[PDB]
Amino acid sequence: PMTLGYWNIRGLAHSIRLLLEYTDSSYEEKKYTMGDAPDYDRSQWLNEKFKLGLDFPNLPYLIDGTHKITQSNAILRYIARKHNLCGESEKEQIREDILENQFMDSRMQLAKLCYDPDFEKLKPEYLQALPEMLKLYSQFLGKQPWFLGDKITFVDFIAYDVLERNQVFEPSCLDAFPNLKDFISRFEGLEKISAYMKSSRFLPRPVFTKMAVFGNK
Template identity: 50%
Template sequence: MAVKTGYWNIRGYMQPIRLLLAHAGVEYEDKRYNVGPAPDYDRSEWLNDKFNLGLDFPNCPYYIDGDVKISQTFAILKYLGRKHNLAAKTEEEQIRVDLMEAEAIDMRTKWSTLCYNADFENMKPDYIKNAPVKLKEVSTFLGSHPYFAGQNITYIDFVIYELLDQNSQLIPGLLDEFPNLKEFHARIGGLEKVAAYLSSDKCIKYPFNGPMAQWGGK
């Protein structure tokens, strides 16, 4: 049975999963649900499927491979990390991955809060001011390592890549003062199968967010 994933027809929380699957060379059906226009933002495409997929906690994104049926972004990423040799291999690596996962969740929450807030324009200056402060910590943590676990690539690298990529669209030149993060971004985006995916018509370049977002949506 073919692997199937499901998410909204945006990059959002699904994009790191798509990048990981591309890197792992997995063929899969990428089900994309559309949301209707304002003011109703009709979600019937998803709601018609939601309770018919056999998911314990029906939500987007989801991943289905035979009897394996998972929702929640990091549950999916961790499973795929173990399955495709993209998980931590030592306790030291696990600690680094756990730390970056927690930081990524915080960063993504702040990003979503900004992008979906009706007060986006007033919040944007503070976000732009504070973004380099957080990235300095991330840059220091990465140090001279090629990947966030250390020498080995793991699922968390695809998460951080996507966060850096989306933030760089909002704040041009954001990575210029952090050469190691800029190199990391290029390293992940330059992985052979990831690069092929990013340049293909399978890859969603835009939108980043749903249509109700103040920035990055349709």
């Protein structure tokens, strides 16, 4: 089985866990915990960061035999490649490349107003930019069931993670774009996705923990 390492938190490993579940990949999780109290002891990770054989140690990581991969996007692409979950035509590849990078940008904007102390100040402004962000994704998705067209590919797992995270942030924003809301619902309704979400394995630690004021769980 493969070993997926990440913090005992949702964060960047969410889309990966979902893809592993979807592809029925055999895997085990190495979870690292952070210091509960104000002294966020990250020593559980720091103690073995340079002892895993990773070229560029980081979380999350994926160990698959001789293959040891870091960088969330590289991990998703690695698994996707093994299961026909990639764009095929030049048009689809251009699209997945733009989307992969665009979603990371959106994720970072939210991550910013999460691991921040004065969240109260910036929230109302992020909410002002959110409609534009969502509108562009809605425009793009259009009438397609998935981001690249009629078939599910790795970018849909990233898309689901960031769109769903905003749904929890402020659900009325997704309501304005039923296109996106239905996408979220269509993804969650996938046979293996539902199974996992009902299983006791699903819930690790919702949102960005106490370390990040947004979703201190």
